[PDB]
Symmetry: D2
Subunit: 134 residues, 4 copies
């Protein structure tokens, strides 16, 4: 896993353009997600069990994404994928074995461009409240 | 689905010099596969029942690829993927609603480089019988 | 250089439905190009002198592509690239040290998807004479 | 231009792995570069003139990279490219028309993975002094 980031302003620049198709993933607990999240973000359960099954490779990230979608999600390895939790500043500040870290590895294998959101939902919701759904 | 081909000879070249990881997909009936197939190739049942599940996006291709593997098949979008049937010369000569075309469409979505083997397992086993497996 | 092909028919399909940007490269002598070439195709002189400059990496392919364009050719690595000569059936039938093979090698380095047109400008102009340009 | 970042720790993780080939680009003035820079970083002159020629598309970024290399540089669109200046924190904190911003656009077009180093040479040299050359 390489691990790269995108900042809020640049994500919004990305969303506002008909340039790229974005897969937005919210890796927080569902109460948080259901409470508020970035528009059209897909909730991927931050479970300790799900982490085990992903690293056991008994679940595929592409499988989890689609099962987690209320919509019928488009899986396409050309989609720019942005992941976020509550307040992680960068990939380096993560522990080697946590869920988000595991999630990024699986994603970087199935998608060409995978980025963590700098500051997480905390910063994003702080800057663009009109872009969050409750 | 765009549809590109690789000729039998460039496949071997692609294999011999391990500069790229190759995912080899045998899309023929199980009996044809189990008889003889290109070394290390993965069999994806030519089931019209599996077809209908793919077009329904009720099963993902990478899911279907890992299910059809004895070893731990590494789903990685930067893998070069080569599909083969019995004796298809190229992608244009395929019907609009056949398993292969359905298979290639879903594969090109999950994988960067996806190629049909020009001539199928007919010409390959006709040229490199030592690279086949009983 | 791996070496993959696209058949005349899938090229047109690739063009008609603008879901991908296509870079069309005519690798024949200038007189052959100027007579008739596939619509919008860029001519890259088959010069043994240009060959030697490419293998010396004294001229870059994207440099050579923009030099050989009347319009502003957008060098973009995510462009689908299709090369053609007069009547080459596939990449395997090419000599190890010919311009085409040298051209494809450098192109695959600068571009994600690079394909030889199966049958060259012979079969294409034999099938879509309306998509040729005098 | 999308614009993404990589932090020092993750760049070093990237360099230390035989996983990916990295193109390291130093976009500062040459006195700074010659004074000290990250090992094997290629100096790309931060010139106001060069900025104009790049945006006029009269110079190609792939052309500039190779001309700027004391070594014979490998241009290959699969190379992970990390760019850095003195102390830019993220892409969003850049002005829309500055050189670095122009540089990132051109690079993102010729390379699949292009990232700005979070904090620039200032932070990198602050953390890994043994990885800088004077």
């Amino acid at each position: 896993m390489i691990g790269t980031q995108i900042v809020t302003e640049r994500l919004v620049a990305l969303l506002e353009s008909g340039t790229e198709k974005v897969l937005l993933i919210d890796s927080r607990p569902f109460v948080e997600y259901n409470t508020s999240h970035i528009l059209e973000a897909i909730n991927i359960n931050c479970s300790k069990l799900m982490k085990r099954r992903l690293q056991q490779d008994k679940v595929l990230i592409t499988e989890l994404i689609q099962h987690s979608a209320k919509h019928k999600v488009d899986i396409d390895c050309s989609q720019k994928v942005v992941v976020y939790d509550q307040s992680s500043q960068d990939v380096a500040s993560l522990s080697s074995d946590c869920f988000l870290t595991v999630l990024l590895g699986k994603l970087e294998k199935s998608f060409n461009s995978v980025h963590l959101l700098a500051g997480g939902f905390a910063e994003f919701s702080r800057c663009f409240p009109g872009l969050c759904e409750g």
